[PDB]
Write a protein that binds this ligand. Structure first.
Ligand SMILES: OC[C@H]1O[C@@H](O[C@H]2[C@H](O)[C@@H](O)[C@@H](O)O[C@@H]2CO)[C@H](O)[C@@H](O)[C@H]1O
Length: 145
């Protein structure tokens, strides 16, 4: 459950799905000209109709920067939860750690807390990791309890 230099866009099955207490650990970097990227925890990888996204984590670099989180269900976006922080920096490496909990995802970037997001889709439905946009990824790891 460790992938080196994945191709972006990345779409891959999460072996065994996710359980509370586990981590998803991403090391990567942001290109000099980035606008946004996203990490999506998905129900499958269908394109038409588009796979549900249980957790859409979407850093956006415009202005002072923010991170938009949401859920896509039956091809409709829910209410956005926007964190007006930007820990990502153009031209710099990062580490993202997503801690899976019973109630929430908790996300840290570079070992600093970033945000919480309550589950909207049942955790057991998630079977696919997608990474899209202007981002480079050195490694993907799923860390057990
Ligand atoms: O909510 C996540 C998605 O947002 C979409 O953009 C929104 C935008 O944030 C919102 O303010 C409004 O203008 O509608 C847009 C379209 O739904 C993105 O296009 C999408 O990729 C997700 O990030």
């Amino acid at each position: 459950k460790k992938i080196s230099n994945p191709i972006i866009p990345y779409v891959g099955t999460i072996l065994g799905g996710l359980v509370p207490g586990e981590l998803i650990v991403l090391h990567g970097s942001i290109p000099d000209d980035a606008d946004r990227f996203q990490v999506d925890l998905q129900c499958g990888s269908s394109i038409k109709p588009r796979a549900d996204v249980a957790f859409h984590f979407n850093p956006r670099f415009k202005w002072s920067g923010c991170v938009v989180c949401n859920t896509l269900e039956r091809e409709k976006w829910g209410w956005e939860e926007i964190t007006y922080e930007m820990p990502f920096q153009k031209g710099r490496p990062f580490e993202i750690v997503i801690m899976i909990l019973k109630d929430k995802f908790q996300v840290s970037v570079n070992k600093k807390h970033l945000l919480l997001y309550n589950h909207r889709i049942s955790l057991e439905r998630i079977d696919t990791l997608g990474i899209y946009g202007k981002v480079q990824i050195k490694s993907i790891e799923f860390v057990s309890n």
